[PDB]
Design a binder for this molecule. Structure first.
Ligand SMILES: O=C(O)[C@H]1CC[C@H](C(=O)O)CC1
Ligand SMILES: O=C(O)[C@H]1CC[C@H](C(=O)O)CC1
Ligand code: NA
Ligand code: NA
Lengths: 357, 359
């Protein structure tokens, strides 16, 4: 069996990484929980066992076979290369390594083949991208993809544990204290690292991450660039609007595509139903469609509202929902680790391609 | 001055109709509040005056100059034609008459000209359509519109008082009692008239109104058909996805357009800023964009996140927000009434063009 380390064990994704590992088939002989200095010495469960949390350092990775990182891009940048030097295979949830050509950016149902040539780091895409890829890959396989326009409805847990607490507190202030939403005080959302913070309670904030030079946010640009890398096709046109709404868990997406060839809607529905990881929930006669509250706790990605555009011959609209901490993060990561195990890919990398510090 | 009746005075829109009339320039000599048998005999204020609510009937409109209806499609179908027969000019918030060729479907900043030939009923479009029209008309004027793709983020007050209360109750059960959102009991949302109801708390429901036979909902198809009528151009391709989210007031929209001519973003921002009823809130260097919580209580429509598509030369994305009970409903209606007054159009219609349903 493996020694597995969870880096960021105390965070929102980390807690789900623990659950997904507890529920995993991976043969784990030893589990280690790593976080920051302020968490060291605390205890968290692995099943029935008490695990003492350790500080993450450049020397903490000796003897580790697999490390799952979800402790912020800074932490991956600092420590993942030391892990690789120590002989670890890293699965990274952060954005840091995603566009490095030496790093596979993987959704196992779509591009598991990219794992074979890994150099010790495998990147998990962002939540919003992952669920979109699970929904769209079976369509691309049969009819191609020319363009995507997506508008998202993203849950606050994607911004971490603090964002969840901020949202709950704000809603209580409005509902219990009669505070006007526009009068609420915010400290984290829309983006912890940006200059100004705004309430999310009873609001829709069209900003996730910070703004890039082209007036799209980094979240929107990640959907664009990650799609192109995962589907191995720079010709797919992708433009996104990424919006935070008052939901704690599960992202929803209104997704428009134009295919290369006309894709009959009943065949599109069947292709999605048949695709591993995607579940068709589409029966409008009985008001059946994906819902955030129903998706929470499931590893599946749910697709419905599938219908042709009213005018564009090759246009199709749909609604895609998945738990953003599960398929959107921790489950995609554990699934990658399970796929590495299946394929005999859990072993030290000989050539170090990642600069130390 | 005018005698003005508010039909549906007690509902979510009706309360804002009252506020908008209290703040109006219209010369009002007499106000009447009409509702159903449920509220008849109760009292509501107009400014400092107590007004007794009356049950709406086919004979309730004698002496009325202007009637503002927001009491559901069936109420407009039943009573608006009797109001017209009585000599009233009706401004209707419901969907009932919107697609009738004898009925102007008006957003005053866009197609006030259509009021001139009214036949006693002027229809307000749906809230989602109204704010989109305010944002897009100044763009259409200069560079044309080939297509629109819109995804909405709609507030629950659009579904009425009961839906507001349901949303508040559900959120309290989760946040104060620790109820799982899945375990919540719903009675109204997504659509009061449909067969099944779902929680809205911590959810996003991709259903507004009921489904039509093409698998789009009636709300989505209203955005399509109303856009074509208001802009007087059946060639504009419009497809919509309409989603309810946990917001009490103000709808937000992610709007994609393709123009006929390339429309430089800096010029688009200036055109929207200059357009009556539209306010540019777009300064990403300082994280300025429209927000539902800031739009509440304002008659303006706020537009930002304006940017060109990454690939389509003529594509533009934006974010449009307005208070759905104000510009989306009560303010559009009062603004129409003020515009009728300005144009000398408040007077009886001789020829009845609408079927009477209570004979
Ligand atoms: O993984 C990433 O690049 C981001 C991490 C934070 C996420 C959020 O704020 O919802 C968005 C994606
Ligand atoms: O005015 C209309 O046709 C509809 C009335 C109900 C509204 C809602 O449920 O938010 C949507 C628009
Ligand atoms: Na499937
Ligand atoms: Na067109």
């Amino acid at each position: 069996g493996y020694t597995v380390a969870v880096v960021g064990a105390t965070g929102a994704v980390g807690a789900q990484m623990i659950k997904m590992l507890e529920e995993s088939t991976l043969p784990i002989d030893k589990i280690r929980y790593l976080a920051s200095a302020r968490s060291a010495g605390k205890s968290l469960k692995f099943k029935d066992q008490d695990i003492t949390i350790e500080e993450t350092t450049e020397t903490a990775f000796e003897g580790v076979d697999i490390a799952l990182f979800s402790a912020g891009s800074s932490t991956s940048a600092k420590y993942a290369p030391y892990a690789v030097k120590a002989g670890v295979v890293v699965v990274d949830n952060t954005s840091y390594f995603r566009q490095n050509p030496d790093v596979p950016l993987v959704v196992p149902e779509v591009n598991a083949h990219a794992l074979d040539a890994h150099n010790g780091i495998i990147a998990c895409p962002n939540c919003s991208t992952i669920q979109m890829m699970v929904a769209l890959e079976p369509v691309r396989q049969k009819w191609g993809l020319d363009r995507i326009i997506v508008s998202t409805y993203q849950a606050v847990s994607g911004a971490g544990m603090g964002a969840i607490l901020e949202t709950q507190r704000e809603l209580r202030e409005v509902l219990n204290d009669g505070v006007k939403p526009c009068d609420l005080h915010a400290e984290i959302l829309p983006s912890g690292g940006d200059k100004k913070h705004y309430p999310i309670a009873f609001n829709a904030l069209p900003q996730i991450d910070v703004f890039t030079d082209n007036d799209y946010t980094y979240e929107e640009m990640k959907m664009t660039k990650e799609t192109k890398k995962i589907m191995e096709d720079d010709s797919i046109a992708v433009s996104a609007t990424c919006v935070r709404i008052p939901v704690l868990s599960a992202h929803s997406e209104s997704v428009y595509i134009e295919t290369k060839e006309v894709a009959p809607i009943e065949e599109v529905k069947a292709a999605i139903a048949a695709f591993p990881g995607a579940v068709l929930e589409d029966d409008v006669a009985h008001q059946i469609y994906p819902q955030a509250i129903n998706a929470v706790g499931s590893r599946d990605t749910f697709v419905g509202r599938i219908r042709k555009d009213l005018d564009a011959e090759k246009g199709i609209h749909m609604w895609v929902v998945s738990d953003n901490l599960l398929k959107g993060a921790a489950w995609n990561s554990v699934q990658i680790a399970e796929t590495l195990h299946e394929r005999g890919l859990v072993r030290p990398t000989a050539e170090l391609k990642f600069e130390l510090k």
